[PDB]
Amino acid sequence: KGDKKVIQHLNKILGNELIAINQYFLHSRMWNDWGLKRLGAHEYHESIDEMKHADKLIERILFLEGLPNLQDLGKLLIGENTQEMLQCDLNLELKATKDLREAIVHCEQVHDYVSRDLLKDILESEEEHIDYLETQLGLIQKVGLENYLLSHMHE
Amino acid sequence: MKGDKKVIQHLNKILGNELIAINQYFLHSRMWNDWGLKRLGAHEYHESIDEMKHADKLIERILFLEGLPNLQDLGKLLIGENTQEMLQCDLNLELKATKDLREAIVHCEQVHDYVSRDLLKDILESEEEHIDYLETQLGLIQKVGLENYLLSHMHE
Amino acid sequence: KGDKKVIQHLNKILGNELIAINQYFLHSRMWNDWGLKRLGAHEYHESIDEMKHADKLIERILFLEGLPNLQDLGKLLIGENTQEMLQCDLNLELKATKDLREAIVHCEQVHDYVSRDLLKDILESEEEHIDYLETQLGLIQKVGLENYLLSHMHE
Amino acid sequence: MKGDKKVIQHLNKILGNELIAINQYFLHSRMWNDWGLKRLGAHEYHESIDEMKHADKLIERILFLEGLPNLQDLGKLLIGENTQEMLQCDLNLELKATKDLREAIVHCEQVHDYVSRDLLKDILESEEEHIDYLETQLGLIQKVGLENYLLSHMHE
Amino acid sequence: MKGDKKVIQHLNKILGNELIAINQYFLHSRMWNDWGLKRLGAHEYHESIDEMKHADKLIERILFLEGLPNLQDLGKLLIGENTQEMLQCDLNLELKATKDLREAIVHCEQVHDYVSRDLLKDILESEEEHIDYLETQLGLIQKVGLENYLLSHMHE
Amino acid sequence: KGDKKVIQHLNKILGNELIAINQYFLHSRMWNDWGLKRLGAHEYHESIDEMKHADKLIERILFLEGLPNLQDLGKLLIGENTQEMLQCDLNLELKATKDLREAIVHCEQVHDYVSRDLLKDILESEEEHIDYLETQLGLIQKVGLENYLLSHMHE
Amino acid sequence: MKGDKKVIQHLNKILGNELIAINQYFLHSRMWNDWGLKRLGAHEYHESIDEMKHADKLIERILFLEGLPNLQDLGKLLIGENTQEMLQCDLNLELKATKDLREAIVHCEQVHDYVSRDLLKDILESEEEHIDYLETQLGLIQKVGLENYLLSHMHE
């Protein structure tokens, strides 16, 4: 029933969500293990956000009579310190929004306006995540790494 | 994440229209209150607040895209001298604003800035509600006559 | 009805308020974009204060049968970092209080004691803003810039 | 602490103005209520109460300064015979009242009676609000017409 | 329905007495407060308020009967210079007032204005209660001595 | 910096506040020791009022970049019975209000309208205190001293 | 019941120390508030209030013992120009105060004034808590450094 290429786009977006879920969940637990509990808590909520995006994508693919692909897990970008982990999440988000833009073009082209609207809501949420990440990396420059970690020790 | 230079230019143009509307509607609100047309005064005040919140969202989007919000350049206020002119001045300003919103949305679509498009569409919906109010008021002036129209807008 | 020179004074104070509104609002949003949320929220409230002063001046000019001038916008002093932004706000406030003092003198001279009282209330509010700004700049000297910014990350 | 003789005279002159306004506004209030213009009657009643409170504060200040409050001499009431004259009568009284308040404030400043000045400025602020109200009503009568204006002030 | 001309004159005479009493009691009230005799001051304030309410009722009745309430003519205030004289001044005013009320009630009866009669009787009951208070206070001054009486009225 | 002569006036007003604080507090505790608890409680609250005036003066002097002078303590006028104590407080207030008027004259001359407004608020409170004191002295004459003390035994 | 003359002198000496501490701690509090170190400012304000309560109890005790409290003679305030000196100044003032309290308690014990001794012991306990706070703060400045210490006392 749904357009084969829209479903292929939705499964590509879903694949990015599945990478983001695992990467942000692991970073969260790394920050909690290091005692950087404010970073840990925020990253956990970012993980949950991705989980909810994946759920909406799976439901849409099934409604369109496609097969959701949860088998293919791309590359996790795992950092070894706070600065690399923030940059790894940012790199993942920039790749995610590029794929969202191309999927939205295709939805418009075949007149799947409901799928386009779902993807635009996901895109809004990803750009809020980019905003957060760029702000944090900018704060590290303004106050220095050690001061930055200090302000994120306690929730 | 650096935004398209021409999208930022469009957003600064919309922002410029918002800043005109903030000042024009606020002055109109206070003129009507000074005349004792408090119902008009209060409605116009809330329209001004609406423009203020639009400007806030635009300023925040421009900064996220790493552009410079322009709050320095203030175009021409259309200040009326009586109720009928003030309503028509607001309508002329809204019709220009929606023309500029349509052109900005077109450009956002071309460069795939779908989040900026969505912000502009939300602002555009609100301006069309403002046009609906203004055209409705001008029609009521014709149906009941000016003095009757003012009479019904004396009390809040 | 009201004295023509008093109305010009009131419109000049109004002109200073309109500059302050835009400058503080922009500075607030700049600080929020940088993640300095305590600075951003305080500066937003300063912006809101100027808005209420402007409202009071517009109402008084209309009662005096004058024409409020919301058309002429003087020069915004936008800083590029926290220390310049604070200094730009301080420069703007010191000019605003100079003009308030000259306006109060004239109101006294022509016996417009109600306009004088309105202007004295605004002046009290401006001096509290000056106290805040000079205190912030002194704290930057006492604890250092990076420590100062660290204390204003979270609201 | 005996007050300045000329400050007390000014304070007694202001009090004399309050006493006229009390009686004038109260009678106008009851005239409007008798005519069934209850919104005008109620607003005018509250203006009368406000003048009563001004008189109270002046009387208390005169006694503290060891003067004799004069409640015996009642100047001329300006009683109108219709709504438009009544508003104009109240406005003429308020314009005279504010002229006298301004001269009293000048004199308080000259002899350094800053507390009396501050009392008089609070009264002056309240009288200028009443002038704002009166001029607005007279403006509305021109904009909507007398019969329409009275219509909107029948019910509370 | 226009009221009897002589009844309206009687009502305006009663109104004139109320206006004297309002000002006399208000000034006496503030004099006692200024002297720190706050219980006397507070009781006298409430007497003043009662006269204000009588005046309001009279003004309303005169207007209903299509007369002109006279708030312009203010008779002689009897201001005392100490507590005993102030109480006696109030008592002298109350006795003059009840004589005028009695004469007004007789005329109302003759021309069958029974509603005006009933209003005046209510006012008279209240005036006789004030006479009861004043005579009681003057008697207490005799029984306990002046200094003890004032001591008893320092605090509210 | 604030005007040098305004600051000097403010330190003079402060010096008077510091005398009243101690004088009224001591009188309050004397009346309590004598069992005149109503006088003691009222005098205590007058002492507290002066403490609040002193606080507002200290804060304004610091804002103007002056040095608050809490070191120089002038002459306390301590009475030995109720009538002298009330008269000592009254003499102190009359001296205080004379100095307030001269300070307000100076504020007006140099356009320090906020300092003027603060001093005018202090003067209003001092004239309320003068009202209380003259009223009490008048009551001692009207009812006699022993009757006056009787009425001030209980709170 | 006349107290021992030397006990009263000791109490007036302790009182003299409290009066210095009131003024010094209040000024330091307002200096810290003026610099934006609001946590230091608030804590120092409460230390000032503590000394005010000590002074009150001493004054009451001196009067009960039929002495004359001396609020006239004010010793030397130790005012610092920065946080570390202000803290050291309060600490130097507290060490002098506790030395005088110990000597007063010795004398109270000698003449069997056990109630005055117990009052002085209560004050001494409170002064030793203040010394604990001051020494802890000075120790923290060494452990974390001055800029970090000030940083942690900016916000209440």
Ligand code: HEM
């Ligand atoms: C791969 C590792 C994952 C981990 C470690 C993980 C962990 C969690 C945790 C700890 C919670 C909170 C549960 C609770 O305490 O109530 C949660 C909630 C949730 N998860 Fe996951 N999750 C993972 C993957 C996924 C995936 C792949 C999906 C869907 C495709 C998903 C969907 C959800 C949803 C819908 C919720 C409820 C969110 C809400 O509060 O609305 N999760 N997950």
Ligand code: HEM
């Ligand atoms: C002539 C210039 C302006 C005037 C007279 C004005 C007036 C006001 C007033 C009276 C309020 C109500 C505040 C309160 O009572 O708490 C307000 C709120 C507000 N203003 Fe303005 N304003 C002006 C310009 C601006 C500008 C340029 C902006 C932003 C770009 C702005 C943004 C806001 C916002 C965000 C609020 C809060 C609205 C809400 O309730 O969500 N204003 N303004």
Ligand code: HEM
């Ligand atoms: C024709 C003369 C006057 C009339 C008809 C009048 C009438 C009234 C009335 C109806 C009230 C409300 C009473 C209540 O319901 O409790 C009132 C209140 C009051 N009046 Fe008068 N009054 C007159 C003159 C005065 C004067 C000469 C003074 C003072 C010098 C005065 C002082 C007051 C005060 C202080 C109140 C209470 C106001 C408040 O705080 O609500 N009145 N008057």
Ligand code: HEM
């Ligand atoms: C010398 C300058 C002084 C200043 C600036 C000052 C300031 C203050 C302030 C601001 C308060 C709080 C008042 C309130 O809002 O409740 C206060 C309370 C108090 N003061 Fe003072 N004070 C001073 C001297 C004194 C002295 C010399 C004494 C006693 C001899 C004293 C006794 C008290 C007492 C008993 C309280 C009430 C504390 C409580 O709540 O238990 N003060 N003071």
Ligand SMILES: [Fe+2]
């Ligand atoms: Fe996502």
Ligand SMILES: [Fe+2]
């Ligand atoms: Fe495609």
Ligand SMILES: [Fe+2]
């Ligand atoms: Fe949607």
Ligand SMILES: [Fe+2]
């Ligand atoms: Fe994301």
Ligand SMILES: [Fe+2]
């Ligand atoms: Fe911890």
Ligand SMILES: [Fe+2]
């Ligand atoms: Fe808008």
Ligand SMILES: [Fe+2]
């Ligand atoms: Fe374009």
Ligand SMILES: [Fe+2]
């Ligand atoms: Fe949206």
Ligand SMILES: [Fe+2]
């Ligand atoms: Fe609009």
Ligand SMILES: [Fe+2]
């Ligand atoms: Fe409407």
Ligand SMILES: [Fe+2]
């Ligand atoms: Fe109205």
Ligand SMILES: [Fe+2]
């Ligand atoms: Fe302002």
